[PDB]
Assembly symmetry: C3
Homo-oligomer: 122 residues x 3
């Protein structure tokens, strides 16, 4: 099962803790509307914790839940948090996606042009 999801950010909190500006311990909490071919197919919610920030690369531990009609999909990542694609591990899901594994690649994170490419093994 594959899916190309267009991601429209719904709400986002970019929490600046600690030292002003992006640094270890900051965190983003967010929700998105998911679409395919211009039709909404579901939504998601997630949190990213900035575990390591250098000027070239802010590293995040991210947790994401996707809600689709057939069920939910759970993913997690420890990756650079940039526009370059990064791949989250799909650890499971519910409904049609129970006991699923696979990968979710995030492109253009935290921009209007964000997309997910899902590859599920089930």
């Amino acid at each position: 099962v594959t899916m190309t999801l267009d991601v429209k950010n719904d709400q986002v909190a970019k929490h600046d803790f600690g030292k002003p500006g992006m640094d270890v311990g900051d965190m983003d909490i967010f929700s998105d509307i998911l679409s395919v071919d211009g039709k909404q197919v579901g939504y998601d919610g997630g949190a990213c914790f900035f575990t390591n920030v250098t000027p070239d690369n802010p590293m995040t531990y991210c947790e994401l839940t996707i809600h689709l009609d057939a069920g939910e999909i759970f993913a997690r990542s420890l990756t650079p948090h940039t526009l370059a694609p990064f791949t989250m591990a799909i650890t499971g899901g519910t409904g049609e996606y129970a006991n699923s594994k696979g990968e979710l690649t995030v492109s253009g994170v935290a921009t209007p042009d964000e997309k997910y490419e899902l590859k599920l093994t089930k």
Copy 2:
């Protein structure tokens, strides 16, 4: 054969982080622990965190993670659901000990009442 369990839940310690804009909005967070009992005897405890991913006046959505500790092992659950007084169902994603390789669901009823319960179906 699926196993069910009915746990009575008493909130132990709780922090409601009102981050971001004061008042309920995206990015707020609850961190909590509970005492678990059955038939009037403590059987374990839990700890968890909820993140408000989307807040509108009609529906505050939370991503929640929960760990239950029993003598027989741990149980892990997660949800992305409205964070209201209505019952909501979490996915059991795994566990330890007796609950190693567990899957299933956990329904939370009466949240933030004295009669809060978890109803588990483990497969």
Copy 3:
């Protein structure tokens, strides 16, 4: 299969919210460099949430992701968060560690002698 990783704290944020000092709702966010025999073999990142604090025991829900070349390892714990050794559950991984389970014991946490001892099944 066992594995012992030496752990060097890289960046750490200790968020003291609410009442000063450890109490429910505080959180630590961290990254580490992982090494074996003095050579870096990967890195990790994690977050701990203080779920219950009494004078005797600061309980944390911790999530950890270890990144090695062969794959990632996911662990989580609900345990006391002291200098004493504590054991995390390995819930999964990627690559070589896909479908991994087991336990990860953290000793010497946040000291120069921190180590992870993994038992993967």
